[PDB]
Amino acid sequence: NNLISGQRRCGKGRNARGIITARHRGGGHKRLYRKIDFRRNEKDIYGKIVTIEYDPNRNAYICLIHYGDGEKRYILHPRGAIIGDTIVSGTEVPIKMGNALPLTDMPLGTAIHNIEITLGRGGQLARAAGAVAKLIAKEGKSATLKLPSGEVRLISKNCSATVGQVGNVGVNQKRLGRAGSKRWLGKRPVVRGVVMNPVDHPHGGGEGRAPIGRKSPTTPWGYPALGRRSRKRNKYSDNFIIRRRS
Amino acid sequence: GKAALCLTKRSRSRKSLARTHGFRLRMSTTSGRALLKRRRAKGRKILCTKTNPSSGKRASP
Amino acid sequence: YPRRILDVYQILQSPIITEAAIKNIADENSLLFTVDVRADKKMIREAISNFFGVKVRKVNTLIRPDGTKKAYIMLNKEYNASELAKKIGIF
Amino acid sequence: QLKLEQKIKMKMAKKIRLRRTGLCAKESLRKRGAWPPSKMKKLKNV
RNA sequence: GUGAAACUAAGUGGAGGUCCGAACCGACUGAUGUUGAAGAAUCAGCGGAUGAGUUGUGGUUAGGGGUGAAAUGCCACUCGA
RNA sequence: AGGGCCUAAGAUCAGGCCGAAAGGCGUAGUCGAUGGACAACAGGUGAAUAUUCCUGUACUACCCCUUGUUGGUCCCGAGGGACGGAGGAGGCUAGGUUAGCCGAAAGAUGGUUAUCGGUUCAAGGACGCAAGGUGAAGGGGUAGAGAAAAUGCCUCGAGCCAAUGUUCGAGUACCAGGCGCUACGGCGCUGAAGUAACCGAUGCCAUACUCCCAGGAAAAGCUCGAACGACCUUCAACAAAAGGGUACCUGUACCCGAAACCGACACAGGUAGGUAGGUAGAGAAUACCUAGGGGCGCGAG
RNA sequence: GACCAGGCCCGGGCGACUGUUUACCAAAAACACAGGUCUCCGCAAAGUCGUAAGACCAUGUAUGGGGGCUGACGCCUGCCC
Numbered sequence A: 001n002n003l004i005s006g007q008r009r010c011g012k013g014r015n016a017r018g019i020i021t022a023r024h025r026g027g028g029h030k031r032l033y034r035k036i037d038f039r040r041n042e043k044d045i046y047g048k049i050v051t052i053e054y055d056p057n058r059n060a061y062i063c064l065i066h067y068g069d070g071e072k073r074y075i076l077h078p079r080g081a082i083i084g085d086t087i088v089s090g091t092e093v094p095i096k097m098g099n100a101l102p103l104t105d106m107p108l109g110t111a112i113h114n115i116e117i118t119l120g121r122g123g124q125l126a127r128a129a130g131a132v133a134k135l136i137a138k139e140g141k142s143a144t145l146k147l148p149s150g151e152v153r154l155i156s157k158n159c160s161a162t163v164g165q166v167g168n169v170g171v172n173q174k175r176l177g178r179a180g181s182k183r184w185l186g187k188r189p190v191v192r193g194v195v196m197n198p199v200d201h202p203h204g205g206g207e208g209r210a211p212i213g214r215k216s217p218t219t220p221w222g223y224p225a226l227g228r229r230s231r232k233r234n235k236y237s238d239n240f241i242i243r244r245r246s
Numbered sequence B: 001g002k003a004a005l006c007l008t009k010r011s012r013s014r015k016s017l018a019r020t021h022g023f024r025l026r027m028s029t030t031s032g033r034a035l036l037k038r039r040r041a042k043g044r045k046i047l048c049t050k051t052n053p054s055s056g057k058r059a060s061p
Numbered sequence C: 001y002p003r004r005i006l007d008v009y010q011i012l013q014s015p016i017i018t019e020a021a022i023k024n025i026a027d028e029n030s031l032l033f034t035v036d037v038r039a040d041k042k043m044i045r046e047a048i049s050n051f052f053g054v055k056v057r058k059v060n061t062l063i064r065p066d067g068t069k070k071a072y073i074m075l076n077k078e079y080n081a082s083e084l085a086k087k088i089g090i091f
Numbered sequence D: 001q002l003k004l005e006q007k008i009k010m011k012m013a014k015k016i017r018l019r020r021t022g023l024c025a026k027e028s029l030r031k032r033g034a035w036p037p038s039k040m041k042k043l044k045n046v
Numbered sequence E: 001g002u003g004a005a006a007c008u009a010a011g012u013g014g015a016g017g018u019c020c021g022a023a024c025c026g027a028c029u030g031a032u033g034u035u036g037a038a039g040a041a042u043c044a045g046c047g048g049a050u051g052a053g054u055u056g057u058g059g060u061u062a063g064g065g066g067u068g069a070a071a072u073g074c075c076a077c078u079c080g081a
Numbered sequence F: 001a002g003g004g005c006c007u008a009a010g011a012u013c014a015g016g017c018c019g020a021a022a023g024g025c026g027u028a029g030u031c032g033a034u035g036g037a038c039a040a041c042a043g044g045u046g047a048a049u050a051u052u053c054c055u056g057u058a059c060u061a062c063c064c065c066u067u068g069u070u071g072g073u074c075c076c077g078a079g080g081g082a083c084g085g086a087g088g089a090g091g092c093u094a095g096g097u098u099a100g101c102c103g104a105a106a107g108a109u110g111g112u113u114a115u116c117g118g119u120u121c122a123a124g125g126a127c128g129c130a131a132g133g134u135g136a137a138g139g140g141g142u143a144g145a146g147a148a149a150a151u152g153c154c155u156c157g158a159g160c161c162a163a164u165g166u167u168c169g170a171g172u173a174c175c176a177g178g179c180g181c182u183a184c185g186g187c188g189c190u191g192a193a194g195u196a197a198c199c200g201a202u203g204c205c206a207u208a209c210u211c212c213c214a215g216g217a218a219a220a221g222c223u224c225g226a227a228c229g230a231c232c233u234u235c236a237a238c239a240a241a242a243g244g245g246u247a248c249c250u251g252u253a254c255c256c257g258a259a260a261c262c263g264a265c266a267c268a269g270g271u272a273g274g275u276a277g278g279u280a281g282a283g284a285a286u287a288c289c290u291a292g293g294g295g296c297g298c299g300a301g
Numbered sequence G: 001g002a003c004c005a006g007g008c009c010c011g012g013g014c015g016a017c018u019g020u021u022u023a024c025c026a027a028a029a030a031c032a033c034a035g036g037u038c039u040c041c042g043c044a045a046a047g048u049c050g051u052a053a054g055a056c057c058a059u060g061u062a063u064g065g066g067g068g069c070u071g072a073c074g075c076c077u078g079c080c081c
Helices: A179-183 B014-021 B023-028 B030-042 C019-028 C041-052 C081-086 D005-031 D037-042
Strands: A046-053 A062-067 A072-076 A086-088 A100-102 A111-113 A133-139 A142-146 A152-156 A160-163 C030-034 C058-064 C068-074
Touching: B014 B023, B023 B030, C019 C030, C019 C068, C019 C081, C030 C041, C030 C081, C041 C058, C041 C068
Parallel strands: none
Antiparallel strands: A046 A062, A046 A086, A062 A072, A100 A160, A111 A133, A111 A160, A133 A142, A142 A152, C030 C068, C058 C068
């Protein structure tokens, strides 16, 4: 195993300056990092699954592949798959669960994942547990995809995608059950707004118990949370997006 | 009580104190270099207290 | 390239003359001296051997708290430190 | 028929790893003091 | 005991922000102390005490700032700057 | 013990980017133990040091010489170092107790020897593992860009892994007690017995076993290895053997549950770790004690 | 038999619960909490910090990530734009 490397960034709520920009982090448990090939760019080399194991750094499980020529890679476990199953990346290849193939040659309407937005990079979309995309159409240079959010988006057709839904569908059936469970998961407590003083947070102060008194529900930094968009405006990708979410 | 109180000092290694306030620290920073200017100007005998030798007698290994 | 720090021909300041040293001459067959603070064991053994033409089983050195290095210079079972030190005015 | 090619290597390997584990049993018993057996025969106090 | 599940008696097992209780960490009540033995203690009892646990070493965050399980509390007996 | 080795958090950062200046970001590297890697124990001595000096017995790293092979060395591609919590059972020892063995014995009082002491030995070398655990540990060739990892072949007095234990170390000491010193301190001579039984750890086996999920550092030393790219090369590089010969810097005093650190005080306070005796007790609580240490720097009524 | 070594019961308010908090007058009914709901964000993500470069988010990608409010669990949560 040369894929399981202890090379954390450490602290990991703190920026370059050294201030807590991303809030409610720390405590946690020490964890390692499994590199995962989201590219799956070992082309025309026939592969075999061997073990399904726990990634501490994810929702979904990881799958250890042994290739025919004799090298090993970690990937995302698809839903139906088991130990000793078979896969391959390339152009031709069948549409059997867990195989990798560019979006052009794929069927119309198949549950898929690990999709690139830009050719070359790797695999950004549908990576969580139960992640699932459904190719709706195709148009010239583009393929029209429906995402896990419930949004239809034009992406480039030459881009890669791995067939099958992503496994471990039941991780919504946790109850955690106690403060301590979320504490050792990495997260930390979240102090409400209305509780604090006026100097700290917009809702702050107020004698007795405070109603959220200032006409709007506010962030810590003045910008109305609870209804108000924030998708820049005239962003580069704007053209490509077709729909909303749910 | 069992936690003592309002003793600002403790007994702490001269390593750490020299890496916080020592000569090599003051000498790096431009702002801090002009503190040594003021110290030689006033003519204080000991410039920056809290300096240690890497060598013996006052070594903090 | 020999010396950690180059120092001198000189090095050796003087022998220590006291009641402990006299007894250590008889017991251990060993001389006692004050040297350079920047003096090395290797440097001392090359000096004293090459000076008197005598062998040195081992040297062992310390820095008394003022900052002056004092060295015990031990001699082989062959060479006799009592008679050697007699002809350098310690007896 | 070359049936001690294990016991050529295995013996010396055992003698290596027993030395190594002996020395590591020393190293870890220095760190947390409690080594030089003069001290250990001296002390038994409460 | 059932088509098999379900269910139930005894064994095995050692979970638990489990229990009682030293070290350890705290600070609920009183008494004492009030030009004190101490610029927050002593004494008698008190809560937790395998965890959101305690702590050594070496580090990080800086005042129109930081940090805050949030009192405007803490940031060298200094804090609505 | 640290440094001459290694890296984490963090730090600084060549070239590079960004900024009125000061500078900010950031890679290659370089620092940075609280961690990895590495070689010594007993007895002895002395106003003040002792794993440092002395005596004995050890071990690590280099330079000789006997055999050798033709290249070494670095870069470099691998193996490995290498890691969690909790729980439980087993085997051991350290330590304790009791007996035996040996020496001593009036302790003024009814009885009484039923009394008092001693009974000790480390590192290391050589050598074997049981109703302790398990039933591939450890190899050898081969294909395919392939020397390692990986797809198929065979083979294993079917066994391994260890802490303890047997010996030397140690016919030496160490030693309870006796026989002489001469004034305020130890010191010369002598020297018996030196075993067994039971209890037994939070210590070791164990970086072992089971279970659990919150999924448990890095880098060098080490071992392979085939390349390519450089250097150093025939008064030479790597392997083994006894005997030799050789051995850098700094710390070492003293206090350190404190009258010496931190609290202005010779202050009822705070302060990381190690060793853990007996009787009673579940117990590191408690009570009374041993070894060891003290009677609290105003007293008298 | 000494030291050592639970007082117990019945009824109500608030908070579910272990937890945290005003060092030096407040330990609670205050904060947090598992759970719930709303709203933002398709990755060159929203948000945050910076004059900038760029850093966190995340070596994560909608069963994920940011923010508002409520506070286990049970039954619920009406009228007004």
